[PDB]
Design a protein around this ligand. Sequence first.
Ligand SMILES: COc1cc2ccc(=O)oc2cc1O
Length: 459
Amino acid sequence: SSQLHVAIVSSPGMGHLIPVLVLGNRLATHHNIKITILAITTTSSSAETEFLKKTTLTNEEKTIEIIPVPSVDISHLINSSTKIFTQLRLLVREALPKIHSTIASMTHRPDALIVDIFCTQILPIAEEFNISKYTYHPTTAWTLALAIYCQVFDKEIEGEYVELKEPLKIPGCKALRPDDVVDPLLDRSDQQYEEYVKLGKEYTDFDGILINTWEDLEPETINALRYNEKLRLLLKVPVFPIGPLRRKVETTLNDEVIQWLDKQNNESVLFVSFGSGGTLSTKQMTELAWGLELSQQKFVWVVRPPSDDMSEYLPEGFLTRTKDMGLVVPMWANQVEILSHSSVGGFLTHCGWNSTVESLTNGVPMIAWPLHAEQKMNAAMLTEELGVAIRPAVLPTKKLVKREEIQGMVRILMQTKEGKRIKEKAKKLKKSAENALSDGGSSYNSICELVKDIRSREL
Ligand SMILES: COc1cc2ccc(=O)oc2cc1O
């Protein structure tokens, strides 16, 4: 059968574009699919727009093309209380005219549209043009089951979710501690709550849902999404675990971090990074600085100014005391390259799924320090279910983590026999992930099943 054309729509931000590009890459190379990426961007001045200028919009063999789609300016449509979830929904809504015309001009219409979590409002455009439409859930199956079931919790639960004193029971799935609810569930009176319940229903309107997870990681929740009688009252279409999708390493030979790592022993270094979406209070940054020093472990720490020469933000004499023990890297690092280095033995992260996937596919265990979005659910999975992470006694967003506990966690993970058990479990998940993505593996098979659904709908 002849070539399929699939357009994938990314919402604004590198955090959304990159996984879309990774999916596009996998579909064009291993699945004979011609890919168009519709990369919705902000009006101006984005890390994303800079990326798109430095990179080429098309590849050698004309199998992938990136079409930047700039949104309009939304600053007049928001205020200081407007949450990120709401802002993303609004940026895509405002780009719908330009998404519509972009698709209209495509003489060879796409055989299918795959849209981001934050692009489900494109659904009526797919309808209008008679294009098969699928959505891509860029994080765990557990969080997908929450979004879809939330419309039930909304009618069955009277007050704030955060005030419940019993787990929320997702049929057939892990029960959810009220402390761990995703961000939009923290305040039902906020606009983003209703937007989130709406999203959970919009999933149901698609022809299928791709998930950035794999069968062996979440067998219970995937099986529930497929067959559980209560969830299937709500979800009528298949799910496709096609992950874990992760960006490729792009080397920089003269990278001083990599040079410093090259001189360390195997699996001896704690990488500490809260990414771009992460900041700590002044008080928390001080405790983290002291915990790292007190641990006497090797570390690489990506530092950013705190929020209530990086020397101003560290304890007096920090860089002198920790010379030879630790590297303080300012603002940014090649994270995927660092996590693949043989000297890295642990990762203190916020548990964003992209970061988690980059860690697990390198077999690196974690200290789970969730901050926002769906990270508390990710952290709960990594520590309670998967056994590849340790964590503070109390959520960092509830209580200050003190230097003593941080010292103790770094030690447990990097020195004790317990930490070695956690590292071995992470090495097993690395293999599970590799198997899933291999030819004939579960995520490979799920892509073939997706392609069959697309073809079937054109008969
Ligand atoms: C803080 O706003 C966010 C909330 C959620 C919730 C579930 C999810 O799967 O992703 C999210 C991404 C976000 O930026």
